[PDB]
Amino acid sequence: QQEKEFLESYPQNCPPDALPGTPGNLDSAQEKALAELRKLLEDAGFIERLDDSTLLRFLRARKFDVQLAKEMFENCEKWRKDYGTDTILQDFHYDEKPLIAKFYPQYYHKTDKDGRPVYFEELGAVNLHEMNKVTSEERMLKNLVWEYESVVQYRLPACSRAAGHLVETSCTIMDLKGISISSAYSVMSYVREASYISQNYYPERMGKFYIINAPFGFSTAFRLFKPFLDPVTVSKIFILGSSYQKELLKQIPAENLPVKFGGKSEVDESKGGLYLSDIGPWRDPKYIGPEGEAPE
Amino acid sequence: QQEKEFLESYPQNCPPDALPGTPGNLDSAQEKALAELRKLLEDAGFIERLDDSTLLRFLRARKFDVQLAKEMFENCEKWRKDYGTDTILQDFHYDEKPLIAKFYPQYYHKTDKDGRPVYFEELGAVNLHEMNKVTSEERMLKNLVWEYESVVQYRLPACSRAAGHLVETSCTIMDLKGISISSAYSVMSYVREASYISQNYYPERMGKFYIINAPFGFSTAFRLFKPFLDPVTVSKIFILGSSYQKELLKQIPAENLPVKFGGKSEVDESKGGLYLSDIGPWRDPKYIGPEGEAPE
Ligand SMILES: CCCCCCCCO[C@@H]1O[C@H](CO)[C@@H](O)[C@H](O)[C@H]1O
Ligand SMILES: CCCCCCCCO[C@@H]1O[C@H](CO)[C@@H](O)[C@H](O)[C@H]1O
Ligand SMILES: CCCCCCCCO[C@@H]1O[C@H](CO)[C@@H](O)[C@H](O)[C@H]1O
Ligand SMILES: CCCCCCCCO[C@@H]1O[C@H](CO)[C@@H](O)[C@H](O)[C@H]1O
């Protein structure tokens, strides 16, 4: 009575108007696709992470090819064992965070109108040189997986309860204000590594993606490739310039969005404002289940 | 005996390994799609431009929806009547060309390895201010349609004969060396207008598209959207930086590519080198048919 107990402690059906193939909306032969991936994995010795939400995201990332879903699934299970992800919430301590946070922000803050936790990344402010004095790329990546594990174990279940429906994804906002060719080159390895970790071991976890303060050449390229990108990806990716407030306020309440991005949400500066904060439904006693409160 | 005489004066079958749906390769039910669009248009009063190559390009631009092909076809026929395209080769004289060519290059020069005429556009060198003294956007657009009409009436048929196979498309090379946000804004209207004229009244005329000397932010965006653009479009579009020679020499011979782009082709400077030139198979007496030599 632990995983089963956890799964039924929060809503498990995505909203009715959600993309097909998502939990509670799968019907078009995909039910049979789901009820096949579970059989193969049960025989292969696997016991955990076989819930509807999990396998469905694996089936969704691989167009519902039950064969490729097993591959992607085993390969991810291989990775969690090697990397020690299963014990990352209690093994790893990013005690350098207060020291380096200002050079590469990274922080979660409340939710958007769909219940998704909002993740902010001020990539344009990054200062790797000043960061390499304290930490290392390896540790920053451990922090990335540590936060991903907080999202699934604590944040998502709490958000589901607060929104009345599932919520398997997050809403991310990346700020490019301040990027240069120089710093862009200095972060490529971390970005390429972080990209590998999520769309392979955390697929379908992205629900919406916003890039604000994107430079002209960059923003222009998107405006020309729009008609050639699949409609499924243009529904999630948003590339906007210096005028982004109206768009953001259209997805995130206003009382939920930080004042710096055109909203009303203010974090007390006498306890690490925004950068060192982690406030949202997951810190509200009435939305915390049998898994207890997430770490800090 | 004029259009019929013209059509059989040059090869009419695309190479065997070409994209399906192209003349001489259409089979998969598309033959019936072709032999339907012609019937509807014959009843609608249309007499010209009903050859396999034409209608097939219209069917290809609209995924083979015979219904939308008729719409796109009539709408283009409407446009040629209004604009006076049918008589553009003899009505319009871009006598300002020698004066303004240096501010917005534009020139055709020989062919690539597939027989396609190569079109060069040094957009990054554009100087609209210096150009507005002499011409106007309206005239530049008339020149664009005048050149398009030389491509189909003279250039393509000559290239077909020289390559031994059809050739319905052109190979374009756009140079961004020298662009600014400023000049990018100063040319948006011409580019937006020119884009409207080709993919609506000259569809499937683009076979390959190369953008060289693309700025970093711009080039980067393409490298991230690559996996999301359809494989049909990534086969035609190439976005490269300052190192483009190897790629170009891989598509265009070397004796065909101008020295400035990393090749061996040199045009005599005592008669308008490149900018004011128009040399290729269409100026070779042995590749000119009953349509005679193209104008200058
Ligand atoms: C200039 C900005 C470049 C940003 C490139 C993406 C860097 C990380 O962005 C992440 O990429 C993941 C891919 O694994 C997605 O699944 C996540 O939703 C996204 O937040
Ligand atoms: C900045 C470039 C775009 C953001 C990174 C790639 C976007 C999505 O990457 C992947 O796309 C899949 C779609 O098949 C989704 O299932 C996953 O959520 C996501 O990991
Ligand atoms: C920064 C460079 C922006 C270039 C945008 C494209 C401008 C013209 O490019 C033309 O566009 C046509 C679309 O109608 C295509 O059919 C042609 O093949 C292409 O040459
Ligand atoms: C710089 C942005 C890309 C170049 C402009 C758009 C590229 C192609 O535009 C159109 O694509 C069609 C494909 O359905 C082809 O049939 C046509 O040749 C082309 O007009």
Curated annotation (Swiss-Prot), chains A, B:
One record GO biological process: post-Golgi vesicle-mediated transport
Reported impact of residue 263 to D: In SEC14(ts); temperature-sesnitive allele that is targeted to the proteasome at the restrictive temperature
Note: Present with 84300 molecules/cell in log phase SD medium.
Covalent link Glycyl lysine isopeptide (Lys-Gly) (interchain with G-Cter in ubiquitin), residues: 39, 81
Pfam families given in the database record: CRAL_TRIO (PF00650), CRAL_TRIO_N (PF03765)
Function in brief: Required for transport of secretory proteins from the Golgi complex. Catalyzes the transfer of phosphatidylinositol (PI) and phosphatidylcholine (PC) between membranes in vitro. Essential for viability and secretion. Exchanges its bound phospholipid with phospholipid monomers that reside in membrane bilayers. Regulates specific trans-Golgi export pathways, like transport from endosomes to the trans-Golgi or transport from the plasma membrane to the vacuole at the level of the endosome.
Places the protein is found: Golgi apparatus membrane; Cytoplasm
A single GO molecular function term of this UniProt record: phosphatidylinositol transfer activity
This protein's GO CC annotations: cytoplasm; cytosol; Golgi apparatus; Golgi membrane
Domain of life, per lineage: Eukaryota
Domain CRAL-TRIO: 96-269
Regulation: The inhibitor activity of SEC14 is controlled by whether PI or PC is bound to SEC14. The pPC-bound form of SEC14 is an inhibitor, while the PI-bound form is not. The phospholipid binding/exchange activity of SEC14 represents a mechanism by which the regulatory activity of SEC14 is itself controlled.
Organism encoding this protein: Saccharomyces cerevisiae (strain ATCC 204508 / S288c)
Protein keywords: Cytoplasm, Golgi apparatus, Isopeptide bond, Membrane, Phosphoprotein, Protein transport, Transport, Ubl conjugation
Topology of the protein relative to the lipid bilayer: Peripheral membrane protein
Listed name of the protein: SEC14 cytosolic factor
InterPro entries, sorted: CRAL-TRIO_dom (IPR001251), CRAL-TRIO_dom_sf (IPR036865), CRAL/TRIO_N_dom (IPR011074), CRAL/TRIO_N_dom_sf (IPR036273), PI/PC_transfer (IPR051026)
Catalytic activity annotation: a 1,2-diacyl-sn-glycero-3-phospho-(1D-myo-inositol)(in) = a 1,2-diacyl-sn-glycero-3-phospho-(1D-myo-inositol)(out); a 1,2-diacyl-sn-glycero-3-phosphocholine(in) = a 1,2-diacyl-sn-glycero-3-phosphocholine(out)
